[PDB]
Structures are given as structure tokens and as C-alpha cells.
């Protein structure tokens, strides 16, 4: 079992935090908030680095380019913005969605951005020009998550409509639909690209072989019936699953046995987002508006 212990609490956001993400080079943590701001923090000591501003309404998600030089943010103002992290300047505003943008990601190559929106569509965008390349009629309800696989050739999307879908990046064609149908609040590809991890608002995480349409594992015991809470694979030490929870705790499961191996206590509101450091056994966690803080935790395995 891991032994994550609190090392830093990071205050500064003035509304609920929505997303935390470590930069791929391990140096930074980015946070987004309903307060319309992105904040950059040192990944190792939690020292505040800078505030990035420009969105007109709150932000649901942020994501890093693979070279850690760009961020993209998804906002209720119906746009995404591409930011140069070093200068804090908005490089591009991605316009096209007709309602709130809820989720976003770069592909590994980082020449594309994928977004999902309340408008039920998935859009694929050219990073260099900011132009929308494809609009996928992906779902019949808000899109809660979008993620590229390890080589960028596939996209997975989830939605409140109860579906997960796998898309061919180049053609935009839907290659697979996984379908009771509780709302899907989060999905991402596994590190080895063969599985997807999906959160449903039945307080359950499920590890699916999407090619076979078989559910290999389920992770339960946490509380998730309302919010789109990020889940993570922890790949630096022991193989874990990490998720926030609506009972204010961080949950950590053994990937193989599905046993809860740790619960991290300290937040005073829903833990809406967690993130796992790329090389060290470090977790970042973030909570809603009774709390508004980010916590950094460290384990020996
Ligand atoms: C000894 N290996 C396994 O037990 C195993 N690895 C995977 N691959 S994975 O999900 O992508 C993955 C997850 C984590 Br957390 C870290 C890494 Cl590095 C990684 O590759 C799946 N499993 C089993 C088979 C179904 C569930 C457990």
C-alpha cells in the first residue's frame, strides 16, 4: 500500500477549483477554476508561479502540450484558449462550440486539440492556426471527457447520454460504441492504450477492454453521483487507480485486486480533481468552493 502524506496546501483561487494537471516535464502544476483563472504552481514545493487570465467565464478543464510550453483551457464562455505558459499570453481563441466547453486535451504530437461541450459535439482543432478541423456529432447529451490514445490515432469520448465512444482521429469516424446507461462523467485511455477507464455516476469506475467490449475491473467504495471527477492511473510506483470523491477524500485502489489501499483526508469539500506526477509518487488534489485549495501529497511507493 502507498503512504501518501500531505506536504503543501495551495490557496489562491476564489471559487471552486475545477481541474489540476502536472506538466509533462514534471516542473509545474496547472489549475483551472470557476473564478475564470488558470494558476501555475511549482510541482515540487507548491510555490505559486503565475496567474493566467482572459476567459470571460469559468473554466472546466486545462491541459498541457507535450513539450510543457502550451496550455489549452475549456470555458463556459464557449471558447477554448491556447496559452503560451512562459509569457501567459493567449495565443489563440478556439471558437465554434455553441455552449459551455467542458473538457479538452492535446494529442501526444500536440498539433491537435480535442474538445467536448454541453452542445453534445466533439471538436478537433488545429493548434497552429486555431481553426476547427472537424465537428463530430458525438453524443446526445453533454460531453464530459475527451482523450487521445498514446499514439494519437484514437479519441475516446464520454457523455451524460450513457455512452463511451472511440473515434478514428484522422477520419472522424466512430469505431466503437460502448453501451443500464448511467451518465458517463469521465473517461480516458489506459497507459498501454488497450483499456479505457470510465467513471459513471453510479459511484463506480470501470476498466474496459473496449476492443472486446468486456469490463475487466471495477473500482468502488468512493462517492460519485453528481460531479465529473477525474480519475488517474498512477504509473510511477505501485500500479494504482486514483480518484477524487464527493465525501471530500482522495481514493487510491490497487489496480489488480480492486481493494481500496488508501484514503487521503484533509479537504473540506468535494475533491473534484486529482492528478499524478509523471516521474515522482506525487498526487495533486483539488476541491470545490467550501475549500478552494489544492493539496500536494507524497508517497514512498
Ligand atoms: C502487471 N500488469 C497489470 O497488472 C496490468 N497492466 C495493465 N496495463 S494498464 O492498465 O495500461 C496500466 C495501469 C497502470 Br495503474 C500503470 C501502468 Cl504502467 C499500466 O500500463 C493492466 N493490467 C491488469 C489487467 C487489467 C487490470 C490490471
**What is the rounded CA–CA span in Å between residue 100 and residue 118?**
5
Could you tell me if the CB of 239 is within 6 A of ligand 1? yes
In ligand 1, the atom with minimum distance to the C-alpha of 193 is 11
How was it solved?
A: X-ray
Q: Which superfamily, per CATH, for 1-301?
A: YVTN repeat-like/Quinoprotein amine dehydrogenase (2.130.10.10)
Question: Order of strands across the sheet with 174-178?
Answer: 143-148, 154-159, 164-168, 174-178
C-alpha cell at 185: 462523467
274 lines ligand 1 (CB under 6 A): no
**CA distances (Å), 31 to each of 100, 123, 291, in order?**
18, 23, 14
- DSSP reduced 3-state for 190: coil
Distance, CA of 116 to CA of 157 (rounded, Å): 8
Distance between CA atoms of 200 and 187, rounded to whole angstroms?
A: 9
Tell how far the Cα of 35 is from the centroid of ligand 1, in angstroms: 37
Nearest CA to ligand 1 atom 18: 235
237 CB within 6 A, ligand 1: no
Q: Report helix, strand or coil for 106.
A: strand
Domain ranges of the chain: 1-301
Q: Establish whether residue 190 lines the binding site of ligand 1, counting it when its CB lies within 6 angstroms of any ligand atom.
A: yes
Amino acid at each position: 500500500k502507498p503512504n501518501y502524506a500531505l506536504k503543501f496546501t495551495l490557496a489562491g483561487h476564489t471559487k471552486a477549483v475545477s481541474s489540476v494537471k502536472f506538466s509533462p516535464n514534471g516542473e509545474w502544476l496547472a489549475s483551472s477554476s470557476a473564478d475564470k483563472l488558470i494558476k501555475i504552481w511549482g510541482a515540487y514545493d507548491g510555490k505559486f508561479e503565475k496567474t493566467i487570465s482572459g476567459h470571460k467565464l469559468g473554466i472546466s478543464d486545462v491541459a498541457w502540450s507535450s513539450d510543457s510550453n502550451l496550455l489549452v483551457s475549456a470555458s463556459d464562455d464557449k471558447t477554448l484558449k491556447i496559452w503560451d505558459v512562459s509569457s501567459g499570453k493567449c495565443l489563440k481563441t478556439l471558437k465554434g462550440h455553441s455552449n459551455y466547453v467542458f473538457c479538452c486535451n492535446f494529442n501526444p504530437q500536440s498539433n491537435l486539440i480535442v474538445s467536448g461541450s454541453f452542445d453534445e459535439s466533439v471538436r478537433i482543432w488545429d493548434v497552429k492556426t486555431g481553426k476547427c478541423l472537424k465537428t463530430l456529432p458525438a453524443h446526445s447529451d453533454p460531453v464530459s471527457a475527451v482523450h487521445f490514445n498514446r499514439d494519437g490515432s484514437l479519441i475516446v469520448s464520454s457523455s451524460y447520454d450513457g455512452l463511451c465512444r472511440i473515434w478514428d482521429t484522422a477520419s472522424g469516424q466512430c469505431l466503437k460504441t460502448l453501451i443500464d446507461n448511467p451518465p458517463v462523467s469521465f473517461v480516458k485511455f489506459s497507459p498501454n492504450g488497450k483499456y479505457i477507464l470510465a467513471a459513471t455516476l453510479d459511484n463506480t469506475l470501470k476498466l474496459w477492454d473496449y476492443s472486446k467490449g468486456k469490463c475487466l475491473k471495477t473500482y468502488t467504495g468512493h462517492k460519485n453521483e453528481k460531479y465529473c471527477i477525474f480519475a488517474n492511473f498512477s504509473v510511477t510506483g505501485g500500479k494504482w487507480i486514483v480518484s477524487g470523491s464527493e465525501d471530500n477524500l482522495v481514493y487510491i485502489w490497487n489496480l489488480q485486486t480492486k481493494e481500496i489501499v488508501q484514503k487521503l483526508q484533509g479537504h473540506t469539500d468535494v475533491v473534484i480533481s486529482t492528478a499524478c506526477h509523471p516521474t515522482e509518487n506525487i498526487i495533486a488534489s483539488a476541491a470545490l468552493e467550501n475549500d478552494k485549495t489544492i493539496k500536494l501529497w507524497k508517497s514512498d511507493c
